[PDB]
Amino acid sequence: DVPTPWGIFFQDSATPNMEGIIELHNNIMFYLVLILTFVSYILYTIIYNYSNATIVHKYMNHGQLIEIVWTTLPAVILLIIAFPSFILLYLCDEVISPAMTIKAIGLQWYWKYEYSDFINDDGEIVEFESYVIPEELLEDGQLRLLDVDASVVVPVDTHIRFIVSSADVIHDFCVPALGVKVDASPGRLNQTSALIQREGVYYGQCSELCGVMHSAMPIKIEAVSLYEFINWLDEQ
């Protein structure tokens, strides 16, 4: 969705993959907070008790049990972290039957979208180019450096496969709410999959550096219902 002004945390989700990402991050933060609090308490004890002290225990320098406890205990934390990470890596993808394909080619400083299906017998494939609206030509209420002239319009509750490539340099397709971040390198095709659960608008920005106009190249996705998608596809 849209960024919020004084943000602290993630944007809201519309895909199961982003919810899995949020849940895994909130699982890791538990153990990291535990470790930081333990270290901070030990430095507080050291500052409060053993500052400018008369007695120096200068012969406690070996240890045998305690060096095993700070070697095996972080390992168990790594195994507990590594279980849901591998489950999220393997499980949530396009296991069964994607239902559409949209090719999002990245040119120099704009985007080119081809809806590769809906082909006539002569090759009448629906296609458009998305640019950025300049600041001088904005209407009342539009978002600066994020609002486009043509937006990618998709149905809800439908698996969508994005195939991303490029024609000039290395780009990066990003819609933060949907959990999509894949490169666009000029000689190979890459694929991602998205399922959208609620209607709305979803905004995104390019990531990998491309030249002077890196900051003006937005991505906008609308998620209409099926009837509106059929009525929109019979107009373009």
Binding site: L32, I46, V56
Partner: protein, 535 residues
């Protein structure tokens, strides 16, 4: 003529370290002013100081990266502290190859000239620090800028290789009479373990940079996909250098902290053999992982699972060092002088900046954080607050011994607190901007990212004032520094004990565990005539 044969045609290892320090100060001033230029543009939405030019923003970021990865941290941590202290700790007169030390210094001022001349003959070199192939070709950057910038990464490579071979060759056969290679101090082990990575990493960088040059100007097409190549190959050939590099910057810091923790807390280090084995494990496991910088390029599903497993393992040896530092500081007596303030501010902020690396190691979570300001906030807590703090602590520790002139304590404490406050204000809201979704390398941003960018522009002006106060601390050290040893008892290297009387303490003042603090303090030009004896 005596000026020339002693400060230009030199053989002495300790007289090149002072030249390295003077060079590093200049090359750390230039990049800091370049960072102030960037942070004064990323303040409020619009086009403020650079009028409409998105070039001369990427050039400033590239030249701020290069001048402080290659020209500040490495010359300070290798030239000033490695050339000076390692012969005195191992007990040698000079280095084994002294003329190679002189060439390893003098290759760097021709490397500064080409980099400063890579930003005046053209638009410039706005390729980023990682000079990726299909942007840095002859279709976006067509001029003598990228070529003169990748010739500044050859001379530094030659200098580092020639220094590393000298460091390895010296510590093997130029020790004193009674030192095996198990009684060495920890700083010598840090220099050895960074010098092995300097051998094993730099040929890959030199090959990748030279093949990029041949692609640009001799139309060879290694990395162009219209002739049968892939850009991704370059990424491999870059990052195999990249991750050894970022341990090269941090391993010489660690040993310095150990000495301070061993000194101002009057206890030996808990488990030294565990510490050298931990540094060896960290050095070895920095070569078997390089592809966690590239999770979004389109790798396999069985290759991400290897690189998530091999990245989180490095947390296990670093925890041994952190907990051993806590066990060393636990029992003993602690007096808070100006090296131990920087020592205490390093054990907390390296942990905070390093715990973010576990969140970024997962391939599932890197889809939300790649090319985002969370990465910037991660590596600034470790680079600016882990390496520069170790450099300041090493300067305030070893500068009275080298120079012979003391410094004002109060102004150094004011400098430390200003650095702490300003740097913690600067790099903490970058985590929030990263979690909300702000990408990297953008001059202008949407209006939602305004407010935190107003706060991170305030701490930089605090840190530059601390740099100016550091300059005044150096000036007050050089002038009237003989009279700055009776103001405070910080000048004493170790304090009197409980039963040790003052009259007994004035006869026997220095108690040490190395050769360093028993020398006369200007160190002599030829410091060992007869050999040293260890049982």
């Amino acid at each position: 003529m005596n000026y020339i044969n002693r400060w230009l045609f030199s053989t002495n290892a300790k007289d090149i370290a002072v030249l390295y320090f003077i060079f590093a100060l200049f090359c750390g001033l230039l990049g800091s002013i370049m960072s102030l230029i960037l942070r004064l543009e990323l303040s409020a939405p619009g086009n403020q100081i650079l009028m409409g030019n998105h070039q001369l923003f990427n050039v400033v970021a590239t030249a701020h990266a290069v001048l402080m990865v290659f020209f500040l941290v490495m010359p300070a941590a290798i030239g000033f502290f490695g050339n000076y202290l390692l012969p005195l700790m191992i007990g040698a007169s000079d280095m084994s190859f002294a003329r190679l030390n002189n060439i390893s210094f003098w290759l760097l001022p021709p490397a500064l000239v080409s980099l400063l001349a890579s930003a005046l003959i053209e638009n410039g070199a706005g390729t980023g620090w990682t000079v990726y192939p299909p942007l840095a070709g002859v279709q976006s950057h067509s001029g003598p800028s990228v070529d003169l910038a990748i010739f500044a990464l050859h001379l530094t490579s030659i200098s580092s290789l020639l220094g590393a071979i000298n460091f390895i060759t010296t510590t093997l056969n130029m020790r004193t009479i009674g030192m095996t290679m198990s009684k060495l101090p920890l700083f010598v082990w840090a220099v050895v373990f960074t010098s092995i990575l300097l051998l094993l990493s730099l040929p890959v960088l030199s090959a990748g940079v030279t093949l990029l040059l041949l692609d640009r100007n001799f139309n060879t097409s290694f990395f162009e996909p219209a002739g049968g190549g892939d850009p991704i190959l370059y990424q491999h050939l870059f990052w195999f250098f990249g991750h050894p590099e970022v341990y090269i910057l941090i391993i010489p810091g660690f040993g310095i902290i150990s000495h301070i923790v061993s000194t101002y807390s009057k206890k030996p280090v808990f488990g030294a053999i565990g510490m050298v084995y931990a540094m060896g494990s960290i050095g070895f496991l920095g070569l078997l992982v390089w592809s966690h910088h590239m999770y979004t390029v389109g790798l396999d599903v069985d290759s991400r699972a290897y690189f998530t497993s091999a990245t989180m393992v490095i947390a296990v040896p670093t925890g041994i060092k952190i907990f051993s530092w806590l066990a060393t500081l636990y029992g003993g007596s602690i007096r808070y002088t100006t090296p131990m303030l920087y020592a205490f501010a390093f054990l907390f902020l390296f942990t905070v900046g390093g715990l973010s690396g576990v969140v970024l190691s997962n391939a599932s979570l890197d889809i939300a954080f790649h090319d985002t300001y969370y990465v910037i906030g991660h590596f600034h807590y470790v680079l600016s607050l882990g390496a520069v703090f170790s450099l300041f602590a090493g300067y305030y520790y070893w500068s009275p011994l080298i120079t012979g002139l003391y410094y004002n304590n109060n102004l150094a404490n004011i400098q430390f607190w200003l650095l702490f406050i300003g740097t913690n204000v600067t790099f903490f809201p970058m985590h929030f901007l990263g979690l909300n979704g702000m990408p990297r390398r953008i001059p202008d941003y949407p209006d939602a990212f305004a407010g935190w960018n107003a706060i991170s522009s305030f701490g930089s002006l605090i840190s530059i004032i601390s740099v100016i106060l550091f300059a005044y601390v150096i000036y007050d050290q050089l002038v009237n520094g003989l009279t700055n040893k009776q103001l405070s008892t910080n000048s004493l290297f170790k304090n009197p004990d409980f039963i040790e009387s003052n009259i007994i303490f004035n006869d026997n003042s220095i108690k040490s565990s190395s050769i360093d603090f028993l020398l006369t303090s200007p160190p002599l030009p030829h410091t060992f005539n007869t050999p040293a004896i260890q049982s």
